[PDB]
């Protein structure tokens, strides 16, 4: 299998727990700041989501220093992913576009 | 059987500290949160703090006297609250609380009843 | 700091009547909202989730409905045993916060 497959395939893999793990901690850090609304894992997990995609609705977001830089880290994640998927794609149609010249 | 368990009383003379266990059984998650929350006789339900024991960190009620400190023991599975210098005005119950972090308390303890007395 | 208004602090209600508790938040916070039911002497227990979420182990007599700020609590043919005090709680924002409490009277 290529390595813009195998990459695909593990960026993937870390995203899923890039969103995993932003959700526990984005809690952890989020708890204790008056008025913050990132406080329960569930939400948690759908506002990772909508930050990894960048759709980012406006419902949720974090208030204090450490949400916001976990949610930093939750963005990049997400848009070097997703980024990375184009990557292969383009490899992909690269490769059998030069077979169909006979290269 | 009885998820969370805590003792029955505790008699503190004022200006002492005492410290009150809750120890869970049960399923146990690293997102459980284990709150702790004051009523005195007659009166409502008031928020004292809460803690994470996978990770260890505490928050506490902004509108009120810190006079609670919240530790926890993983191994034992036992939640602590150590409060400091009281006075009549902190004789009540406390209970202590299990949330999945999911924003509600699905188990309380039975509760402990603190006396501030000589 | 959301303030959760329970009102009236005590409901008269006659035996198999129907009866509903109010919760209303200082401010809008969609269904986070959690009902307890607390007897003489006895711990707080669980009653509802959510706004409306049953929780097993409960009579399906219990219901619950609203969203945003105005939440109720309903009993269908209230008895004897339902006496105690109700308190709803908000986990939309933190801290979380308890409503003051509304006690149930039965009168026979």
């Known amino acids: 299998s290529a390595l813009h497959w195998r990459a695909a395939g593990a960026a993937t893999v870390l995203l899923v727990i890039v969103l995993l793990a932003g959700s526990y901690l984005a809690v952890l850090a989020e708890r204790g700041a008056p008025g913050a609304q990132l406080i329960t894992y569930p939400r948690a997990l759908w506002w990772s989501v909508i930050t990894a995609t960048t759709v980012g609705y406006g419902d949720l977001y974090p208030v204090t220093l450490w949400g916001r830089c976990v949610a930093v880290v939750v963005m990049v994640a997400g848009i070097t992913s997703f980024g990375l998927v184009t990557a292969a794609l383009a490899t992909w149609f690269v490769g059998r576009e030069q077979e169909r010249r006979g290269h | 059987q009885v998820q969370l368990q805590q003792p029955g009383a505790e008699l503190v003379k004022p200006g002492a500290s005492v410290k009150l266990s809750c120890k869970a059984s049960g399923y146990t998650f690293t997102s459980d949160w284990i709150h702790w929350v004051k009523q005195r006789p007659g009166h409502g339900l008031e928020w004292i703090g809460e803690?994470?024991?996978?990770?260890?960190?505490?928050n506490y009620n902004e509108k009120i006297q810190k006079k609670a400190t919240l530790t926890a023991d993983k191994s034992s599975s036992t939640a602590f609250m150590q409060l400091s210098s009281l006075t009549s005005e902190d004789s009540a119950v406390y209970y202590c609380?299990?949330?999945?972090?999911?924003?509600?308390?699905?188990?309380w303890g039975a509760g402990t009843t603190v006396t501030v007395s000589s | 700091d959301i303030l959760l208004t329970q009102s009236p602090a005590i409901l008269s209600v006659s035996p198999g009547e129907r009866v509903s508790f109010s919760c209303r938040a200082s401010?809008?916070?969609?269904?986070?909202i959690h009902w307890y039911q607390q007897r003489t002497n006895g711990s707080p227990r669980l009653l509802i989730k959510?706004?409306?979420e049953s929780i097993s182990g409960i009579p399906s007599r219990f219901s619950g409905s609203g969203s945003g700020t105005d939440f109720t609590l309903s009993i269908n043919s209230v008895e004897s045993e339902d006496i105690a005090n109700y308190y709803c709680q908000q986990s939309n924002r933190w801290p979380f916060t308890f409503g003051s409490g509304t006690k149930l009277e039965i009168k026979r």
């Open positions: 959510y706004a409306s």
């Open positions: 401010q809008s916070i969609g269904t986070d």
């Open positions: 803690i994470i024991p996978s990770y260890g960190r505490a």
């Open positions: 609380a299990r949330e999945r972090g999911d924003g509600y308390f699905a188990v």
